[PDB]
Amino acid sequence: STGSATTTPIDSLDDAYITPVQIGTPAQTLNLDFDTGSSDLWVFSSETTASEVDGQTIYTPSKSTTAKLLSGATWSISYGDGSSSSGDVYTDTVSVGGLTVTGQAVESAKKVSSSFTEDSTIDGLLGLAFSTLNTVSPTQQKTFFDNAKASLDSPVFTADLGYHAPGTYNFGFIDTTAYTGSITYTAVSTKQGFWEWTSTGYAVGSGTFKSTSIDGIADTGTTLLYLPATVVSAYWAQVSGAKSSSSVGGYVFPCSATLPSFTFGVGSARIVIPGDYIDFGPISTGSSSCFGGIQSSAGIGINIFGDVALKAAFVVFNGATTPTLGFASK
């Protein structure tokens, strides 16, 4: 089997991407944030505290003939940005782009933090990291990809995120028309439960490539590119007037600037992020200070190749017995 679904930016800045997902019988379609940095499939639901729902589409398990309470199971997750959610668990039929998993754990939110409430466009998250990170207790549950894997034509999924445009998540096949040149594959460590890999270096603009190992995670659920302070300083030093602002919470730059590109290494290959991908717009409406798309990972504990980086590539998440990651230009 295979699946193919379009993923769409939630706003004009590509702050996140949503992908329609069918849950239950008859289908209830929710727009989920596919997140290769976590491993829970959770949704706004009929159980979510009413004051914490503001415009989201909800899953109502009582209206699904295939929903079953997973008795005694609870979940609770906290993300790197300080957001969180928790609740109980149903199993139900879940389909993405024509690919169907029966008995998928669908984690129903009883509580969500303010940032989730405030984002009316995101109805939940669909985790695509390794199932070892799944938070369901006392019986840990599998991700949609792990459940689907054995049925897939090939044990892979791909992320093809657009810049200010829709893109695609495919399951079970590699669309050889979706990228240019060849795909370079690189080793993955699953020790922390992430798609963790080591970039071979970077360049800023037309500058020389610096060969240096940068361990980080491929995380579709993180908006920005978070890298070591040395790398990030070298980038922003090439933008007149750019500075790190503690009050704003990162590097900002004059909105009048033309940003240089940023290149990262994948083995001997190179992925170029155009400068425009690094512009996240005015810090507040009408401001001439703009927020940067490359930020320091110093306070995080891990480097994160988020959407800013991934959207510059066609990315293969290879879930074979020994997982690997592939990157191609496009």
Bridge pairing between strands 210-218 and 303-305: parallel
Question: Rounded to whole angstroms, how far apart are CA atoms 212 and 202?
Answer: 8
Buried b (16+ CB within 10 A) or exposed e, 76-106: ebebbeeeebbbbbbbbbbbbbebebeebbb
* C-beta closer to ligand NCCc1cccnc1: residue 35 or 92: 35
Taking residues 201 to 220 in sequence order and writing x for each that binds ligand NCCc1cccnc1 by CB under 6 A, - otherwise, the string is ------------------x-
CB of 125 to ligand NCCc1cccnc1, least distance (A): 6
Question: Rounded to whole angstroms, how far apart are CA atoms 157 and 46?
Answer: 31
Query: By CB under 6 A, is residue 87 in contact with ligand NCCc1cccnc1?
Result: no
Which entry of 35, 88, 123, 307 is annotated as an active-site residue?
35
Dihedral sign (CA 118, 97, 194, 231): negative
Which entry of 38, 86, 131, 199 is annotated as an active-site residue?
199
Tokens encoding 10: 């939630």
Residue 326 phi/psi, 5° resolution? Answer: -120, 140
* C-beta closer to ligand NCCc1cccnc1: residue 38 or 200: 38
Q: Which residue is nearest to ligand NCCc1cccnc1 (CB)?
A: 37
Q: Is 45 a catalytic residue?
A: no
* 236 Ramachandran zone, left/alpha/beta (phi>0; psi -120 to 50): alpha
Query: By CB under 6 A, is residue 118 in contact with ligand NCCc1cccnc1?
Result: no
Query: By CB under 6 A, is residue 52 in contact with ligand NCCc1cccnc1?
Result: no
* C-beta closer to ligand NCCc1cccnc1: residue 42 or 236: 42
Q: Is 123 a catalytic residue?
A: no
3-state secondary structure of 151: helix
Interface residues with ligand NCCc1cccnc1 (CB under 6 A) are 33, 35, 37-38, 79, 81, 83, 125, 219, 221-222
The set of catalytic residues is 35, 199
